[PDB]
Write a protein that binds this ligand. Structure first.
Ligand code: FMN
Ligand code: FMN
Ligand code: 4HC
Ligand code: 4HC
Lengths: 217, 217
């Protein structure tokens, strides 16, 4: 099988973890750097990836399922790490300056061209919603990073469970300081599936027929 | 360098294509199958990938830049193929029926279980607009597929240019029948960069400091 297809046909959504296997620091570092290298509109990187690693952090995450989507709760303490994909509520010219400044430092643009580079920010200004927030534009960038992450995990042979069945309001309360100026609509548990109780590991993958999703013109 | 990091450090946004090189059908088939295998919330697959391959289709795509984002227009005819990432405006039970029916046909589930599988559709009603549109939920799923595609292209060593600088309104007119019931906010040109005029090929990649985007708890 072609290596790319093999990876995408073999990755799946784990439904039960093995609490005695942890992701190595070597593998976790690759995943985190892969997330950092994700592409985004105008190199905005309007995101923050929060890694729930410690027992104390896991308890806090565990508690965010207090009143909603409890079918996802058992994974928190059983898996190795949980990653929160946070997207910025509003993206300002100041946030953008952080990017442009770094670009001047990395030698991709000149300080003179920097001011000239601020014109690409108009693209952000046009995507400003009712309340003056850009969350409808920043959230999709974070999902792009998530797609990158899922492909990355398939290559490292690490199991995962993407989760939209979370409580964003309660997460913003529990991780108050960390999610300041951001929102979190999706989290990702990673680890190693349970050898006998992860029933999804044995089910066939199902997707729509090629002609139902692809059109060639 | 670690294979995953090498791929992500070496892929970049091409700013000029070589019109004499096309993507092979073998490579195109891998990319399209990779898009099809993308994960999505509840396996909804609320997307359609439209491939602009023929000269006639390229002309239509070329014409969608008549009003705006002219800086992106030259790539259309120069590159090999353009892929439109379309997301569904509203996701219904009939839409989910198609997913569940294919799941049954894929032996993933049984007809009896197909009836109980619709209980997962409750999560789609949770993203219904005041207008009844789920575009704020479907668009992020399409961006996840895009993140998957960008990683896939890095593995195949094919150049690309993601494009949000497009005209969704003009696209809806030009690709009237193909996009009925969908919207398209991002397209992707693929091909091979111009050997000497693609200036971005020689510029360093720039991303925010690890500490600025990643928090470990
Ligand atoms: C954005 C997103 C959110 C999802 N949320 C959940 C979730 O809350 N719980 C879980 O069990 N699975 C969740 N999934 C898993 C999907 O059901 C799964 O990706 C889809 O059925 C395709 O199956 P595979 O992932 O097994 O290929 C989610 C997936 C995506 C991409
Ligand atoms: C969603 C999205 C839309 C983008 N739109 C454009 C576009 O219209 N034109 C183009 O030249 N670059 C576009 N880019 C490219 C980004 O500027 C580029 O990904 C970011 O600067 C990081 O650089 P790299 O992609 O070279 O790593 C887009 C990227 C993303 C992910
Ligand atoms: O030069 C660019 C680069 C971008 O990332 C971009 C994004 C959205 C709109 C237009 C754009 O123009
Ligand atoms: O069983 C599932 C599968 C999903 O993909 C999902 C998505 C969002 C909310 C809850 C969910 O529960």
């Amino acid at each position: 099988t072609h290596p790319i297809i093999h990876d995408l046909e073999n990755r799946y959504t784990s439904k039960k973890y093995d609490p005695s296997k942890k992701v190595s620091q070597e593998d976790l570092a690759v995943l985190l750097e892969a997330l950092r290298l994700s592409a985004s509109s105008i190199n905005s990187q309007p995101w923050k990836f929060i890694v729930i690693e410690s027992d104390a952090a896991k308890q806090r995450m565990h508690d965010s399922f207090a009143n909603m989507h409890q079918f996802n709760q058992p994974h928190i303490k059983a898996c190795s790490h949980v990653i929160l994909f946070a997207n910025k509520l509003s993206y300002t010219r100041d946030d953008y300056d952080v990017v442009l400044s770094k670009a001047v430092a990395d030698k991709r643009i000149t300080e003179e061209q920097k001011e000239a580079a601020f014109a690409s920010f108009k693209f952000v200004e046009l995507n400003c919603d009712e309340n003056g927030e850009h969350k409808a534009w920043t959230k999709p960038q974070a999902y792009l990073a998530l797609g990158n992450a899922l492909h990355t995990l398939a290559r490292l042979n690490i199991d995962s469970t993407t989760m939209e069945g979370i409580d964003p309001e309660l997460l913003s309360e529990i991780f108050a300081d960390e999610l300041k100026g951001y929102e979190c609509h999706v989290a990702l548990a990673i680890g190693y599936h349970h050898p006998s109780e992860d029933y999804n590991a044995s089910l066939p993958k199902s997707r729509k027929a090629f002609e139902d999703v692809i059109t060639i013109l």
